[PDB]
Ligand SMILES: NC(=O)c1ccc[n+]([C@@H]2O[C@H](COP(=O)([O-])OP(=O)(O)OC[C@H]3O[C@@H](n4cnc5c(N)ncnc54)[C@H](O)[C@@H]3O)[C@@H](O)[C@H]2O)c1
């Protein structure tokens with residue numbers, strides 16, 4: 176009989192679901208509770224996880240025929256990887272499908288803070304056109320951008336802000352060579368503190384690890400300029416959200432723009448919603464039609480590979496492959 | 505010691521200091537023609553802050569006038585003929601905020617593509633799941649249509665092509681095609697072609713009799729239903745009544761406006777009740793850098809004419825021989 180696939184959340188483009196349905200039977204859940212996942216996972220061979228939905232260890236353990244878990248994008252913080260590896264279940268992500276889209280969105284957010292764009296749009300529409308008399312937009316030319324995490328997106332962001340705006344770009348990333356920054360005109364710094372002291376804009380593009388977990392706390396905001404801005408499009412847990420709220424109240428920084436949150440989705444009464452110079456979007460930086468199509472096709476094709484016994488291109492737990500063999504033959 | 509009247513203050517105080525160092529100055533705030541009239545009779549130079557008016561009857565009262573300086577490019581509110589008839593040199597101060605307006609244009613283009621202020625409002629109201637209902641636009645490989653390829657249009661075209669990966673078309677009857685070539689754009693003779701091909705149309709023309717209300721309903725009918733209009737040039741270039749109708753009939757998707765006709769916009773402007781509309785209160789050229797270069801340049805030209813040296817931005821160089829007759833020889 177045809178294998179079953181569980182979609183914990185739809186894909187961002189249904190070209191991926193169409194591909195899955197060529198050879199599997201799928202069931203789609205919509206923001207399901209842990210029990211709904213436990214009911215629907217028992218006989219599936221493949222699972223797709225739309226961020227920020229979570230797949231805990233207890234759910235993976237009930238799935239006796241599971242072969243592969245696919246995430247919606249790069250991040251895997253909603254998968255229990257240890258549990259999958261213990262069971263011989265292959266975990267794949269879909270990286271670098273939204274690189275252009277997030278760099279565009281980050282540039283848009285950097286520019287919107289500098290020009291107070293949403294605040295000013297709200298002022299004109301309410302009748303306070305004459306707020307212009309006390310407004311002083313920032314000219315981005317020759318200001319300094321600090322990139323934390325110089326990977327696919329961070330490097331593109333450094334490239335664009337150079338070409339588009341004439342900004343000086345500094346980067347902090349211990350795991351990449353200095354030459355990677357020079358190629359796009361940036362300077363790789365060994366000391367994050369230097370980047371924090373020199374930057375007028377600080378943009379986050381790291382992977383979420385135990386080192387980047389809550390990297391940006393009150394200690395780090397104290398080191399940034401009072402005039403400076405934070406932008407986070409990477410992961411919510413990189414920023415202590417409670418510390419960010421204190422930092423804004425105490426004028427440690429001037430504002431921020433966030434596409435990611437912790438917890439995500441954010442609560443209805445999040446105190447960040449009442450702050451001057453705060454710009455939010457609901458994890459849409461990497462969700463353009465182009466990026467959604469590419470990541471959907473990628474996730475669907477990888478799920479099909481593992482069902483066939485074929486090694487996929489984006490295994491994140493390759494040490495689990497032999498135990499997968501053990502169970503798949 | 506010579507007098508200088510400032511009909512309106514300068515954009516940066518450094519310019520008033522440069523004048524004060526050799527002249528005696530008086531400053532007026534939005535003065536009536538009569539207020540100017542009994543303040544101008546003994547002065548040698550006059551500065552006009554846009555959009556203040558310097559009428560011919562006022563100039564005729566000023567017996568010792570040598571120079572008039574506007575705050576920016578615009579001299580339309582100055583009676584050039586009366587100045588020439590009297591041997592008064594009129595100077596403007598052009599191209600002082602080119603980079604600032606280019607930046608503001610990039611901000612508005614991007615904010616429209618990413619639905620930035622609308623998404624900000626949605627998260628702040630707890631409507632994070634609006635993400636399931638929409639997708640931002642990826643600028644890469646979209647077509648940008650530049651109307652008016654001058655200082656700002658040339659910069660905007662270059663960055664959107666080089667840094668954003670957009671195809672750029674341009675319409676401007678009064679520059680050669682090679683000017684677009686150089687920055688990766690294509691100058692088209694037929695505006696209709698640019699309208700049909702563009703996903704974003706940005707206006708950067710001078711306000712002339714030809715461009716007054718150039719963008720009416722017959723123009724919006726030719727744009728794409730999915731396209732956006734950006735206007736950071738002059739408000740009279742757009743018939744706002746037709747823009748309102750165009751949004752209501754979904755002839756275009758939305759618009760970003762820094763300028764208005766009438767200006768200031770009224771409290772009951774229909775444009776506010778549209779979601780894909782982004783407004784700013786005529787601030788695109790306002791940056792500390794731009795204000796400082798304009799004020800310094802304005803002061804420096806006034807000081808040259810009082811000394812007898814030709815300033816670099818003479819609007820009416822035909823008045824020079826009579827100026828010589830009056831104050832030198
Ligand atoms: N819509 C969205 O907001 C969404 C879209 C896709 C990417 N994501 C997120 O953006 C982030 C980056 O994406 P990417 O594709 O460029 O990943 P990437 O793997 O290409 O780059 C990550 C970079 O972080 C760096 N890094 C790791 N540890 C670090 C540390 N301790 N200090 C500084 N830098 C460190 C890595 O060396 C690496 O260069 C990811 O968290 C990803 O999940 C955002």
Ligand SMILES: NC(=O)c1ccc[n+]([C@@H]2O[C@H](COP(=O)([O-])OP(=O)(O)OC[C@H]3O[C@@H](n4cnc5c(N)ncnc54)[C@H](O)[C@@H]3O)[C@@H](O)[C@H]2O)c1
Nearest residue numbers: 652653654655656675676678708709710714736737788789
């Ligand atoms: N929003 C602001 O704060 C403010 C700031 C300065 C500039 N202004 C306005 O922005 C606009 C662009 O500034 P600029 O420095 O680039 O002016 P510019 O003189 O450098 O360029 C004007 C261009 O419009 C073109 N043009 C004239 N008639 C045209 C027509 N019928 N069709 C198409 N193009 C035509 C000219 O050939 C010229 O190339 C101006 O209207 C200017 O007054 C905005």
